[PDB]
């Protein structure tokens, strides 16, 4: 039968409620913040988080101010999603606090996607540094590439002419920043909120090159919410 469709992948990512995260660097990127109810809410949520004493306790302290992190195995991405979805006593507006930012948020979605068995047989997963600025890549993004694809490896850059047909972009930070799923969660580049800063990019992880992938269990994650009927 048919493989898993973009719509079902997007629905799986919607279950994570990425718009509800505390986006710890929201104040650094006003130009990336959508004027939507979600964007307004995210701005206010960060205000409440930032000066709450619990934001300066682990792991919140570390989630809000990350050291360079470059996961190189599928299981690390799955664990990243699992750890960020743990609910602790720290709540804002009655909602358990989860925290991420422009660099590492994409790792959560890489874990969600790597944990799905029907994604495994239809797409390879990659994680790229994007939003290039003065030799730095400010923003990591997750990609779904059709099976068979090999993206350039550093120091070669990823550009449009080596971006495979059928690639889907996954950017949970964009959703934290108020953009809708249709601009961020498993969509083509023409639909992507930050499509003028997508290229050039650097490819930091390719599941197609990860020898540990096959022994990485699927179904490890519980979706953060269940889709409403």
Short mmCIF file of C-alpha atoms in Angstrom, two decimals:
data_model
loop_
_atom_site.label_atom_id
_atom_site.label_comp_id
_atom_site.label_asym_id
_atom_site.label_seq_id
_atom_site.Cartn_x
_atom_site.Cartn_y
_atom_site.Cartn_z
CA UNK A 1 0.00 0.00 0.00
CA UNK A 2 0.84 3.69 0.10
CA UNK A 3 3.67 4.95 2.31
CA UNK A 4 3.16 7.47 5.09
CA UNK A 5 1.98 10.81 3.69
CA UNK A 6 3.19 14.32 4.55
CA UNK A 7 -0.20 15.00 6.21
CA UNK A 8 0.25 12.17 8.74
CA UNK A 9 3.85 13.23 9.45
CA UNK A 10 2.65 16.78 10.06
CA UNK A 11 -0.12 15.50 12.32
CA UNK A 12 2.42 13.52 14.38
CA UNK A 13 4.52 16.70 14.79
CA UNK A 14 1.42 18.75 15.69
CA UNK A 15 0.88 16.34 18.62
CA UNK A 16 4.05 17.76 20.20
CA UNK A 17 2.41 21.18 20.64
CA UNK A 18 5.65 22.99 19.77
CA UNK A 19 3.86 26.34 19.96
CA UNK A 20 3.58 25.85 23.72
CA UNK A 21 7.31 25.62 24.39
CA UNK A 22 9.21 28.34 26.15
CA UNK A 23 11.45 29.68 23.38
CA UNK A 24 14.38 30.99 25.43
CA UNK A 25 15.86 33.15 22.65
CA UNK A 26 12.58 34.66 21.42
CA UNK A 27 13.83 38.15 22.34
CA UNK A 28 16.90 37.76 20.11
CA UNK A 29 14.84 37.09 16.98
CA UNK A 30 11.89 39.53 16.73
CA UNK A 31 12.23 39.32 12.94
CA UNK A 32 11.44 35.59 13.13
CA UNK A 33 8.40 36.03 15.39
CA UNK A 34 5.04 35.64 13.67
CA UNK A 35 2.21 38.03 14.55
CA UNK A 36 -0.23 35.34 15.42
CA UNK A 37 -1.99 34.39 18.65
CA UNK A 38 0.71 31.78 19.07
CA UNK A 39 3.54 34.27 18.62
CA UNK A 40 2.01 36.74 21.09
CA UNK A 41 1.47 33.93 23.58
CA UNK A 42 5.06 32.70 23.18
CA UNK A 43 6.43 36.18 23.88
CA UNK A 44 4.41 36.43 27.08
CA UNK A 45 5.29 32.88 28.13
CA UNK A 46 8.98 33.65 27.90
CA UNK A 47 8.52 36.80 29.96
CA UNK A 48 6.99 34.74 32.76
CA UNK A 49 9.61 31.99 32.48
CA UNK A 50 12.67 34.22 32.33
CA UNK A 51 12.31 35.73 35.79
CA UNK A 52 10.76 32.71 37.55
CA UNK A 53 13.28 31.28 40.01
CA UNK A 54 12.77 27.78 38.60
CA UNK A 55 14.20 28.79 35.22
CA UNK A 56 17.59 29.06 36.90
CA UNK A 57 17.59 25.42 38.04
CA UNK A 58 18.71 22.38 36.02
CA UNK A 59 17.80 21.30 33.42
CA UNK A 60 16.02 24.56 32.51
CA UNK A 61 19.23 26.58 32.92
CA UNK A 62 21.01 24.39 30.37
CA UNK A 63 18.05 24.13 27.96
CA UNK A 64 17.84 27.94 27.86
CA UNK A 65 21.58 28.53 27.27
CA UNK A 66 22.92 25.55 25.35
CA UNK A 67 26.53 24.54 24.94
CA UNK A 68 27.28 23.42 21.37
CA UNK A 69 25.55 20.07 20.90
CA UNK A 70 26.06 17.92 17.83
CA UNK A 71 24.28 14.61 18.17
CA UNK A 72 25.63 11.99 15.82
CA UNK A 73 23.30 9.02 16.47
CA UNK A 74 19.60 8.37 16.09
CA UNK A 75 19.18 7.33 19.72
CA UNK A 76 20.52 10.71 20.90
CA UNK A 77 17.78 12.51 18.98
CA UNK A 78 15.12 10.20 20.42
CA UNK A 79 16.46 10.84 23.93
CA UNK A 80 16.49 14.59 23.30
CA UNK A 81 12.74 14.53 22.56
CA UNK A 82 12.05 12.27 25.53
CA UNK A 83 13.96 14.47 27.97
CA UNK A 84 12.41 17.72 26.78
CA UNK A 85 8.90 16.23 27.14
CA UNK A 86 9.30 15.38 30.81
CA UNK A 87 6.83 17.32 32.95
CA UNK A 88 8.13 18.69 36.20
CA UNK A 89 6.63 20.89 38.88
CA UNK A 90 7.57 23.99 36.86
CA UNK A 91 4.38 25.30 35.19
CA UNK A 92 3.35 28.55 33.47
CA UNK A 93 -0.35 29.35 32.98
CA UNK A 94 -1.06 25.86 34.32
CA UNK A 95 1.03 24.22 31.59
CA UNK A 96 4.21 22.25 32.27
CA UNK A 97 7.29 24.08 31.05
CA UNK A 98 9.37 22.76 28.15
CA UNK A 99 12.24 24.87 26.83
CA UNK A 100 14.25 25.18 23.65
CA UNK A 101 15.87 27.73 21.32
CA UNK A 102 17.02 28.36 17.73
CA UNK A 103 19.92 25.93 17.70
CA UNK A 104 18.76 22.71 19.37
CA UNK A 105 14.97 22.69 18.98
CA UNK A 106 15.17 20.81 15.65
CA UNK A 107 16.75 17.86 17.49
CA UNK A 108 13.39 17.20 19.18
CA UNK A 109 11.65 16.70 15.83
CA UNK A 110 14.54 14.59 14.53
CA UNK A 111 13.85 12.26 17.47
CA UNK A 112 10.11 12.18 16.83
CA UNK A 113 10.70 11.30 13.18
CA UNK A 114 13.47 8.75 13.81
CA UNK A 115 11.17 7.01 16.31
CA UNK A 116 8.49 6.38 13.65
CA UNK A 117 8.70 3.06 11.80
CA UNK A 118 6.77 4.21 8.73
CA UNK A 119 9.07 7.21 8.38
CA UNK A 120 12.06 4.81 8.52
CA UNK A 121 11.06 3.10 5.29
CA UNK A 122 10.03 6.20 3.32
CA UNK A 123 12.52 8.91 4.33
CA UNK A 124 16.02 9.41 5.59
CA UNK A 125 16.46 12.09 8.29
CA UNK A 126 19.06 14.84 8.30
CA UNK A 127 19.86 17.74 10.61
CA UNK A 128 21.37 20.86 9.12
CA UNK A 129 22.77 24.15 10.29
CA UNK A 130 21.03 26.98 8.51
CA UNK A 131 20.47 30.76 8.87
CA UNK A 132 24.07 31.38 7.97
CA UNK A 133 25.63 34.56 9.27
CA UNK A 134 29.31 35.45 9.28
CA UNK A 135 30.54 31.86 9.22
CA UNK A 136 28.05 30.77 11.88
CA UNK A 137 24.85 28.83 11.30
CA UNK A 138 22.36 30.25 13.80
CA UNK A 139 19.48 27.81 13.31
CA UNK A 140 19.33 24.04 13.00
CA UNK A 141 16.59 22.45 10.91
CA UNK A 142 15.47 18.84 10.45
CA UNK A 143 14.95 17.38 6.98
CA UNK A 144 13.08 14.40 5.63
CA UNK A 145 14.77 13.34 2.39
CA UNK A 146 13.44 10.64 0.08
CA UNK A 147 15.26 7.34 0.44
CA UNK A 148 18.37 7.22 -1.72
CA UNK A 149 19.42 10.81 -1.12
CA UNK A 150 22.91 11.78 0.02
CA UNK A 151 23.36 15.36 1.04
CA UNK A 152 26.72 17.10 0.87
CA UNK A 153 29.03 16.57 3.81
CA UNK A 154 31.01 19.35 5.48
CA UNK A 155 32.84 21.37 4.38
CA UNK A 156 30.66 21.27 1.26
CA UNK A 157 27.52 23.40 1.71
CA UNK A 158 23.95 22.41 1.09
CA UNK A 159 22.39 24.69 -1.54
CA UNK A 160 19.23 24.52 -3.63
CA UNK A 161 20.87 22.68 -6.53
CA UNK A 162 21.84 19.76 -4.26
CA UNK A 163 18.52 19.72 -2.30
CA UNK A 164 16.59 16.58 -3.34
CA UNK A 165 13.16 16.63 -4.93
CA UNK A 166 10.63 15.72 -2.28
CA UNK A 167 12.60 17.01 0.72
CA UNK A 168 10.42 18.15 3.62
CA UNK A 169 11.50 20.72 6.19
CA UNK A 170 10.77 20.35 9.92
CA UNK A 171 11.35 23.41 12.10
CA UNK A 172 9.74 23.26 15.56
CA UNK A 173 11.39 26.57 16.55
CA UNK A 174 9.41 28.30 13.80
CA UNK A 175 6.23 26.94 15.48
CA UNK A 176 7.47 28.11 18.89
CA UNK A 177 7.96 31.49 17.20
CA UNK A 178 4.30 31.59 16.17
CA UNK A 179 4.34 30.20 12.63
CA UNK A 180 1.70 27.62 11.71
CA UNK A 181 2.43 23.95 10.97
CA UNK A 182 1.89 24.63 7.28
CA UNK A 183 4.99 26.85 7.32
CA UNK A 184 7.19 24.61 9.47
CA UNK A 185 6.17 20.98 10.09
CA UNK A 186 6.98 18.63 7.17
CA UNK A 187 6.55 21.08 4.31
CA UNK A 188 8.36 21.88 1.06
CA UNK A 189 10.74 24.82 0.88
CA UNK A 190 8.22 26.98 -0.96
CA UNK A 191 5.94 26.75 2.14
CA UNK A 192 8.74 27.30 4.73
CA UNK A 193 8.61 30.36 7.01
CA UNK A 194 12.35 31.05 6.73
CA UNK A 195 12.92 29.93 3.17
CA UNK A 196 15.17 32.87 2.19
CA UNK A 197 17.65 31.93 4.93
CA UNK A 198 17.47 28.16 4.33
CA UNK A 199 20.56 28.10 2.08
CA UNK A 200 23.49 27.90 2.39
CA UNK A 201 23.42 25.19 5.03
CA UNK A 202 25.74 22.60 6.52
CA UNK A 203 24.74 18.98 7.05
CA UNK A 204 25.61 17.86 10.56
CA UNK A 205 23.79 14.52 10.67
CA UNK A 206 22.48 12.05 8.09
CA UNK A 207 20.67 8.94 9.32
CA UNK A 208 21.70 7.32 6.03
CA UNK A 209 25.32 7.44 7.31
CA UNK A 210 24.52 6.34 10.87
CA UNK A 211 25.53 2.70 11.45
CA UNK A 212 23.50 2.63 14.67
CA UNK A 213 20.21 3.45 12.96
CA UNK A 214 19.05 -0.09 12.25
CA UNK A 215 19.46 -1.18 15.88
CA UNK A 216 17.60 1.90 17.13
CA UNK A 217 14.15 0.88 18.34
CA UNK A 218 11.05 2.66 17.08
CA UNK A 219 8.00 3.50 19.22
CA UNK A 220 10.13 4.66 22.14
CA UNK A 221 8.31 7.98 22.41
CA UNK A 222 4.84 8.81 23.66
CA UNK A 223 3.32 11.65 21.62
CA UNK A 224 2.99 14.65 23.91
CA UNK A 225 -0.76 14.83 23.23
CA UNK A 226 -3.24 12.65 21.42
CA UNK A 227 -4.86 14.09 18.31
CA UNK A 228 -8.45 15.21 19.00
CA UNK A 229 -11.23 13.30 17.22
#
